[PDB]
Design an enzyme around this catalytic site. Structure first.
Site, PDB file in Angstrom:
ATOM      1  N   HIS B  62       0.832  -1.206   0.000  1.00 54.20           N
ATOM      2  CA  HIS B  62       0.000   0.000   0.000  1.00 54.20           C
ATOM      3  C   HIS B  62       0.870   1.262   0.000  1.00 54.20           C
ATOM      4  O   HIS B  62       0.642   2.171  -0.783  1.00 54.20           O
ATOM      5  CB  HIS B  62      -0.978   0.004   1.168  1.00 54.20           C
ATOM      6  CG  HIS B  62      -1.803  -1.239   1.289  1.00 54.20           C
ATOM      7  ND1 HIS B  62      -2.681  -1.654   0.313  1.00 54.20           N
ATOM      8  CD2 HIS B  62      -1.913  -2.139   2.296  1.00 54.20           C
ATOM      9  CE1 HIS B  62      -3.271  -2.772   0.703  1.00 54.20           C
ATOM     10  NE2 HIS B  62      -2.823  -3.086   1.902  1.00 54.20           N
ATOM     11  N   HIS B  92       5.580   7.087   6.492  1.00 53.22           N
ATOM     12  CA  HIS B  92       5.323   6.619   5.143  1.00 53.22           C
ATOM     13  C   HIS B  92       4.920   7.828   4.309  1.00 53.22           C
ATOM     14  O   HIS B  92       4.573   8.859   4.853  1.00 53.22           O
ATOM     15  CB  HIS B  92       4.171   5.595   5.139  1.00 53.22           C
ATOM     16  CG  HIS B  92       2.861   6.170   5.581  1.00 53.22           C
ATOM     17  ND1 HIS B  92       2.497   6.232   6.906  1.00 53.22           N
ATOM     18  CD2 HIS B  92       1.852   6.753   4.880  1.00 53.22           C
ATOM     19  CE1 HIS B  92       1.322   6.832   7.005  1.00 53.22           C
ATOM     20  NE2 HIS B  92       0.908   7.153   5.790  1.00 53.22           N
ATOM     21  N   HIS B  94       2.560   9.204   0.721  1.00 47.20           N
ATOM     22  CA  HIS B  94       1.573   9.000  -0.344  1.00 47.20           C
ATOM     23  C   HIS B  94       2.038   9.852  -1.489  1.00 47.20           C
ATOM     24  O   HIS B  94       2.549  10.934  -1.244  1.00 47.20           O
ATOM     25  CB  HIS B  94       0.194   9.457   0.114  1.00 47.20           C
ATOM     26  CG  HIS B  94      -0.264   8.787   1.363  1.00 47.20           C
ATOM     27  ND1 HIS B  94      -1.144   7.729   1.364  1.00 47.20           N
ATOM     28  CD2 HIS B  94       0.068   9.001   2.656  1.00 47.20           C
ATOM     29  CE1 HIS B  94      -1.362   7.342   2.612  1.00 47.20           C
ATOM     30  NE2 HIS B  94      -0.623   8.087   3.415  1.00 47.20           N
ATOM     31  N   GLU B 104      -2.620  13.779   0.051  1.00 48.95           N
ATOM     32  CA  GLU B 104      -3.939  13.382   0.533  1.00 48.95           C
ATOM     33  C   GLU B 104      -4.704  14.665   0.888  1.00 48.95           C
ATOM     34  O   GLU B 104      -5.748  14.968   0.296  1.00 48.95           O
ATOM     35  CB  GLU B 104      -3.815  12.409   1.710  1.00 48.95           C
ATOM     36  CG  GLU B 104      -3.071  11.126   1.328  1.00 48.95           C
ATOM     37  CD  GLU B 104      -3.602   9.894   2.022  1.00 48.95           C
ATOM     38  OE1 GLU B 104      -3.381   9.789   3.245  1.00 48.95           O
ATOM     39  OE2 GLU B 104      -4.252   9.052   1.341  1.00 48.95           O
ATOM     40  N   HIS B 117       3.793  11.389   6.057  1.00 48.72           N
ATOM     41  CA  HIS B 117       2.994  11.200   7.263  1.00 48.72           C
ATOM     42  C   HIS B 117       3.843  10.523   8.331  1.00 48.72           C
ATOM     43  O   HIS B 117       4.188   9.334   8.201  1.00 48.72           O
ATOM     44  CB  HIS B 117       1.787  10.264   6.966  1.00 48.72           C
ATOM     45  CG  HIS B 117       0.633  10.939   6.288  1.00 48.72           C
ATOM     46  ND1 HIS B 117      -0.324  10.255   5.556  1.00 48.72           N
ATOM     47  CD2 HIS B 117       0.285  12.244   6.238  1.00 48.72           C
ATOM     48  CE1 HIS B 117      -1.200  11.116   5.079  1.00 48.72           C
ATOM     49  NE2 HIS B 117      -0.858  12.326   5.484  1.00 48.72           N
ATOM     50  N   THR B 196      -6.303   7.611   6.883  1.00 51.13           N
ATOM     51  CA  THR B 196      -6.685   7.747   5.476  1.00 51.13           C
ATOM     52  C   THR B 196      -6.717   6.393   4.738  1.00 51.13           C
ATOM     53  O   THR B 196      -7.036   6.328   3.559  1.00 51.13           O
ATOM     54  CB  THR B 196      -5.716   8.654   4.731  1.00 51.13           C
ATOM     55  OG1 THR B 196      -4.415   8.060   4.772  1.00 51.13           O
ATOM     56  CG2 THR B 196      -5.691   9.993   5.340  1.00 51.13           C
ATOM     57  N   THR B 197      -6.330   5.323   5.406  1.00 50.45           N
ATOM     58  CA  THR B 197      -6.444   3.993   4.834  1.00 50.45           C
ATOM     59  C   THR B 197      -7.348   3.181   5.739  1.00 50.45           C
ATOM     60  O   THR B 197      -7.522   3.548   6.900  1.00 50.45           O
ATOM     61  CB  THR B 197      -5.074   3.285   4.752  1.00 50.45           C
ATOM     62  OG1 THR B 197      -4.541   3.186   6.064  1.00 50.45           O
ATOM     63  CG2 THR B 197      -4.096   4.050   3.858  1.00 50.45           C
TER      64      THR B 197
HETATM   65 ZN    ZN Z   1      -0.692   8.195   5.430  1.00 49.57          ZN
HETATM   66 ZN    ZN Z   2      -3.268  -4.780   2.899  1.00 49.54          ZN
END
Ligand code: ZN
Ligand code: ZN
Ligand code: ZN
Ligand code: ZN
Ligand code: ZN
Ligand code: ZN
Ligand code: ZN
Ligand code: ZN
Ligand code: ZN
Ligand code: ZN
Ligand code: ZN
Ligand code: ZN
Ligand code: ZN
Ligand code: ZN
Ligand code: ZN
Lengths: 251, 258
Positions: B62, B92, B94, B104, B117, B196-197
């Site tokens: 991801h 991590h 995005h 995001e 983030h 956000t996930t």
């Molecule tokens: Zn994030």
């Molecule tokens: Zn997964």
């Protein structure tokens, strides 16, 4: 979360996984006085000739060797199986000493380890859909005795120090799981389930009667860590009650 | 298999298995600077990353994550809108397929090329697991990434991305200094947001820095060469791994600066 120690071992899995006290739990003791020869059982078809291993990984519970399962290249047919079951991975369970380690037992005899090759029923389209059906998985079990070195196991032993701890994996291509079989495909079979959480009752178990021999090769298994020290040993569930089920023998 | 960012499992479709996706405090949101009002009672942000101890970097299909030892108060976030101490657990990014998209959060509907983030959990609750199940459980510091000169502090992370190209791989990643990923100004906005996930739990005090950091075209092009898939599976490049802005609802975005 769960594991095999004092705190989260098989004793304590019923707490978060109520199914642990269910109708079709695995493993079981295979009692050869009660497991009766059924002649209507067909012979076991194993085709691993074109198996395509991808990687080997330490998940903090065992190590797994994964395979490409996008085609019918490494499959299990015949025996008690209607349909085709593709090979998704294999892993071992083993013990701290040579007198323990196998999940299944034969007349209460334990072996030093047990090889589990996991297959899913191509009927259901993918692994995820398969596991939520009673006829979803088929696991071929193979007992490991102490003796001469299994030449086919040596490649896998080789690569265990580069996945010593939880989370690590290595590329693991061109592995031939035919080399992990005994000569005889004689088996027992019964409607079982997964021996680890989530313990879903979706496995047709197929346990081979002839064990394979390995060298005092087993000492490399025991050097792996549960953690990312706690040594990865005695990663087996003990036998569960047989209940209203019937273990059937091909021989 | 499961959720992701493509046509069949992208943000459009998360509401199907994660009903909370249509909730009161979803993230990210568009930060409108004409309506986000300066609150003087907001304290200055305290960032102590001097003793941060990175352990590993892993590709989870991801994003990629850089994890840290969070057994002590060595890499923490205090001050600002935060009552208590929040330790650093990982960071991590995005990012997007082009330079005109990838962040995001947005500012006045402007998207940036990526968003960093840094995730922290409230030491009040004892561990990460217990913390996520509280509205004041996490604090994520968001930082926008513009295209420009090469971020010298990011280079060590760029360097190691080819040894975690695909899902499931990880590498040892020690002695990383996340101070090197900060802008000079700690001026921020803040609001009660969420992850956000999936599982999209509503447990984040969001803190978004206004000053972006600059990165090189060369540096962001390494992000885009990562795969959503594992080794052996078919190719899917890891790009556009952002959720779009969600409605603000009854919430108020507050600014630390005039
Ligand atoms: Zn994030
Ligand atoms: Zn997964
Ligand atoms: Zn109990
Ligand atoms: Zn686990
Ligand atoms: Zn597959
Ligand atoms: Zn087929
Ligand atoms: Zn097993
Ligand atoms: Zn590789
Ligand atoms: Zn819908
Ligand atoms: Zn406006
Ligand atoms: Zn205005
Ligand atoms: Zn306006
Ligand atoms: Zn920790
Ligand atoms: Zn290492
Ligand atoms: Zn795909």
């Amino acid at each position: 979360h769960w594991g095999y120690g004092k705190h989260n071992g098989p004793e304590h899995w019923h707490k978060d996984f109520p199914i642990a006290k269910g109708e079709r739990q695995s493993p079981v003791d295979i009692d050869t006085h009660t497991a009766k020869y059924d002649p209507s059982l067909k012979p076991l078809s194993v085709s691993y000739d074109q198996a395509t291993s991808l990687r080997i990984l330490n998940n903090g519970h065992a190590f797994n060797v994964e395979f490409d399962d996008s085609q019918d290249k490494a499959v299990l047919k015949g025996g008690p199986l209607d349909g085709t079951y593709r090979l998704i991975q294999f892993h071992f369970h083993w013990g701290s000493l040579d007198g323990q380690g196998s999940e299944h037992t034969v007349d209460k005899k334990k072996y030093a380890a047990e090889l589990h090759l996991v297959h899913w029923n191509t009927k259901y389209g993918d692994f995820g859909k398969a596991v939520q059906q009673p006829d979803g998985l088929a696991v071929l079990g193979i007992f490991l005795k102490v003796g001469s070195a299994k030449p086919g196991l040596q490649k896998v032993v080789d690569v265990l120090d580069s996945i010593k701890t939880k989370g690590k994996s290595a590329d693991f291509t061109n592995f031939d799981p035919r080399g992990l079989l005994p000569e005889s495909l004689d088996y027992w079979t019964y409607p079982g389930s997964l021996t680890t959480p989530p313990l879903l009752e979706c496995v047709t178990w197929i346990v081979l009667k002839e064990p394979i021999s390995v060298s005092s090769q087993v000492l490399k298994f025991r050097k792996l860590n549960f953690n990312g020290e706690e040594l990865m040993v005695d990663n087996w569930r003990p036998a569960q009650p047989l209940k209203n089920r019937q273990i059937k023998a091909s021989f």
